[PDB]
């Protein structure tokens, strides 16, 4: 057992230098002595960037570095560019026989100014509650860089189960919009005193509730 | 040097698939070759590992024993023989070569402890839809101010909305194999079923 | 009269208790005089209290192989197979170096491991002489239209007999009860015996033989995964330090019909066996009576419903149905000469009746050699039928 984590966003100016983290919970020394970076551009199949913790393959960009301690794993890349917005995920492994991917980074190289997002929050309808069937749906509007953080509260204990969110995409305006979905049953969405949308952007939080 | 991936498309739940990938420019019997599979818009998640020999075939922990991993050195092919399929194994399967752990272990036989490796080959991925019905109910999204509806449970994509004859969010895969989106009176067609829906939002 | 069409037929007569032998295959009709003629057949024979000493895998199938290995100075490798009872594994050494994937040459730990799986085993099964159950079919000869040949035996009693409770009294509705004191006649004891059975084939071995075999085995206190001694079907290969192969050691199946050539064999029917053995019988007819015989004479003509008929021994059978008035009613039955002076043949199904008119009476008898006449029934409408018997 060993599971790896990145941060869900990270977003920098072209030119500048950013690093992105890979940590591990039942990890050690070697898990990171091991690492392996990723990129998949969007659409496209993913590349080597790293391994062996710190090693550049020939073709791959000197921009491109990596470094690793006892307790993370990180790739640095310096004077960003346009063509480096992609996702990056890291590598290593799980046990001494399988291996194990981080959840990934979304890498924004910033164009305009950043922008906090809109959040609305629909409680079931009455007609969807006739059905026998309870659907919370959590709008999420008007974000730059298209990367947040969902998490849903039932009174004050976080929801996991029924959840779906959706990935962000572009709206007309170029700012990012996403939405997700907490699924219960009409006695569930009863069973509570409140049930709550939490929304993560640049580090901040909003959070509504019905 | 490339790999080609076959075998992806729509499956039934609890049906079974059978995944093939042609290698070529490279001494693909000395290789481990590796599957790694993608949700759509999620995650890399790594699947198996067989190699030279296929003496060592390893799997993922949610693969309880459903997929099978193989391999034809002669016919430089990879498969994967995937049982027992759910909503949760739709994705985009890669065809992936170990390029790294050839430098160090030409043979490509020993199974050693987490040795240096580094998945530097990939194929373009076939894509695997696990869903069970083969051809949605529309709900208002009650109120400046937003307002909107909410079109669930309908396959496969894609649903337009469309306002008195706006922000209409992408779908998201339930757990159930049907989709659902929303749009922000809403008409919502559904050309795949020939269904059209036409809904008052009031406050 | 379920013996009627079986070729192992044995007539048996007694003095006024008799001695029968009964066995499987073997049919036994007994007369005696003023009592009713029976059919005795052992049907079935079972072990019913078997302790599972041993189980054998006879086929093996290996199965889920897993490997791993260490670099020289790298320590031991290990699996978390090596723990779990269904896998087989073994440790060995193979040549490590630069071109192989270690920074320093020399011998470099490997284990395989993989899952025994058995397809085919033997069980030895210790059976008590005592708990050898005997099922016993007492048809009478009741004449009943059904009865000839009817294995159902909803016309004979079922009786069960071990070689401790030999003495059994069985009623027979409408003949009163028989008395029967078995002993079995075994071809070989139970005295040190291990009842192999395969699959559908069992043998009588000597226990240590059978305790000796060199297979994998489960005792018969785990009828269970963990199979002992695998490594007699399981070999492990790594001749060139290279790599190691797990390899299954083949179907021992025909190899054991081959040493068990001289071992006495048993035919086998899940839990049931089909035992060459006898049974030796002692029963008495005391308490037996004829289902009757305090009844007067047909007044009335009877009809031939089914052409007369020869069994393997000679003796005939004829089913005849009534067409008069009476019944219940007793039938006047004769094998006599072609002139009718004496009276020749010997009456099989003793004190023959018709119990009602509809259903048909099927009566057996050993008709004389050469010309008889069978006579059934009384004047007018008597039915008068030649017979040849070479
Ligand atoms: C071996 O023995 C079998 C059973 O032995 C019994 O022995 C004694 C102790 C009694 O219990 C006795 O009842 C049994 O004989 C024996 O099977 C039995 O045979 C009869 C046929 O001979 C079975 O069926 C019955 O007959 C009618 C047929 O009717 C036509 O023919 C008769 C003349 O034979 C005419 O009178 C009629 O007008 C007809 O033209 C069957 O149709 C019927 O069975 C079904 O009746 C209705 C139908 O809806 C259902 O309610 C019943 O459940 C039946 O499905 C009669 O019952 C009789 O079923 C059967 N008994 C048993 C227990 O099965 C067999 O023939 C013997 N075999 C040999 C080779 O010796
Ligand atoms: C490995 O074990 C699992 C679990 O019992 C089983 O489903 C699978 O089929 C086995 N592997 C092979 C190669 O049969």
């Known amino acids: ?204 939080t909003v959070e509504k509730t019905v | 040097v490339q790999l080609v991936e076959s075998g992806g498309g729509l499956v039934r739940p609890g049906g079974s698939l059978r995944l093939s990938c042609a290698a070529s420019g490279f001494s693909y019997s000395n290789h481990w070759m590796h599957w790694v599979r993608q949700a759509p818009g999620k995650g890399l998640v790594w699947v198996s590992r067989i190699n030279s020999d296929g003496s060592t075939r390893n799997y993922a922990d949610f693969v309880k024993g459903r997929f099978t991993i193989s391999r034809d050195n002669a016919e430089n092919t990879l498969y994967l023989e995937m049982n027992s399929l759910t909503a949760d194994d739709t994705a985009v399967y890669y065809c992936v070569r170990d390029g790294v752990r050839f430098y160090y272990d030409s043979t490509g036989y020993y199974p050693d402890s987490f040795f240096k490796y580094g998945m530097d080959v990939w194929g373009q991925g076939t894509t695997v839809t696990v869903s069970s019905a083969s051809t949605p109910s529309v709900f208002p999204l009650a109120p400046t101010a937003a307002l909107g509806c909410l079109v669930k449970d309908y396959f496969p994509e894609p649903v337009t909305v469309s306002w008195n004859s706006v922000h209409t969010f992408p779908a998201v895969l339930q757990s159930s194999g049907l989709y659902s989106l929303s749009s922000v009176i809403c008409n919502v067609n559904h050309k795949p079923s020939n269904t059209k829906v036409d809904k008052r939002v009031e406050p | 009269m379920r013996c009627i069409g079986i070729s192992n037929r044995d007539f048996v007569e007694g003095v006024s208790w008799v001695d029968i032998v009964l066995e499987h295959g073997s049919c036994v009709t007994t007369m005696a005089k003023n009592k009713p003629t029976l059919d005795f057949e052992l049907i079935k024979t079972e072990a019913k209290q078997p302790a599972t000493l041993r189980k054998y895998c006879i086929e093996a199938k290996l199965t889920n192989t ?238 031939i419903v089914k052409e007369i008929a020869e069994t393997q021994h000679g003796t005939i059978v004829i089913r005849v149905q009534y067409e008069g008035d009476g019944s219940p009613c007793k039938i006047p039955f004769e094998i006599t000469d072609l002139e009718k002076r004496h009276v020749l043949g010997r009456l099989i199904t003793v004190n023959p009746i018709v119990t009602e008119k509809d259903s048909p009476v099927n009566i057996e008898a050993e008709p004389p050699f050469g010309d008889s006449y069978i006579i059934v029934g009384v004047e007018p409408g008597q039915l008068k039928l030649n017979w040849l018997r070479p």
């Open chain 1, 1 to 204: 057992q060993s599971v790896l984590t990145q941060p869900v966003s990270v977003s920098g100016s072209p030119g500048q230098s950013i690093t992105i983290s890979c940590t591990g919970t039942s990890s050690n020394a070697d898990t990171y002595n091991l690492v392996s970076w990723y990129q998949q551009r969007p659409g496209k199949a993913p590349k080597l960037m790293i391994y062996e913790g710190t090693k550049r393959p020939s073709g791959v960009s000197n921009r491109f570095s990596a470094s690793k301690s006892a307790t993370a794993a990180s790739l640095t890349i310096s004077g960003l560019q346009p063509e480096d917005e992609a996702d990056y995920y890291c590598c290593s492994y799980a046990t001494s026989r399988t291996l194990v991917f981080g959840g990934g980074t979304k890498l924004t190289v910033v164009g305009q100014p950043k922008a906090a997002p809109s959040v609305t929050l629909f409680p079931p309808s009455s007609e969807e509650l006739q059905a026998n069937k309870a659907t919370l749906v959590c709008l999420i509007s008007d974000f730059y860089p298209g990367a947040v953080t969902v998490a849903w509260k039932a009174d004050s204990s976080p929801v996991k189960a029924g959840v779906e969110t959706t990935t962000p995409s572009k709206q007309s305006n170029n700012k990012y919009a996403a939405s997700s979905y907490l699924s219960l049953t009409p006695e569930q969405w009863k069973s509570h005193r409140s049930y709550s949308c939490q929304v993560t952007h640049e580090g901040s």
């Open chain 3, 66 to 303: 897993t490997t791993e290995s260490r670099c020289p100075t790298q320590g031991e490798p290990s699996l978390n197979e090596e723990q779990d009872k269904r896998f087989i594994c073994k440790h060995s050494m193979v040549d490590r170096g630069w071109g192989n994937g270690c920074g320093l040459f020399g011998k470099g730990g490997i284990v395989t491991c993989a899952k025994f799986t058995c397809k085919k085993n033997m069980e030895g099964k210790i059976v008590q002489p005592e708990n050898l159950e005997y099922t016993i079919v007492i048809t009478p000869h009741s004449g009943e239209e059904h009865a000839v040949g009817n294995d159902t035996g909803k016309h004979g009693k079922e009786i069960k007999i071990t070689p401790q409770s030999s003495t059994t009294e069985a009623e027979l509705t409408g003949y009163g009860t028989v008395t029967m004191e078995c002993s079995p006649r075994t071809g070989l004891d139970f005295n040190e015996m291990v009842l192999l059975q395969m699959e559908d084939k069992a043998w009588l071995v000597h226990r240590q033989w059978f305790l000796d075999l060199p297979l994998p085995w489960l005792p018969g206190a785990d009828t269970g995964s963990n199979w002992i001694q695998k490594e007699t079907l399981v070999t492990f290969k790594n001749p060139h330090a290279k790599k190691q192969d797990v390899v299954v050691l083949g179907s021992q199946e025909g190899a054991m019909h081959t040493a068990l050539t001289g071992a006495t064999e048993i035919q086998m029917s899940s839990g049931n066996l089909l035992f060459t053995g006898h049974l030796k019988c002692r029963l008495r007819m005391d308490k037996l009576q004829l289902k009757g015989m305090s009844y007067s004479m047909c007044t009335g003509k009877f009809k």
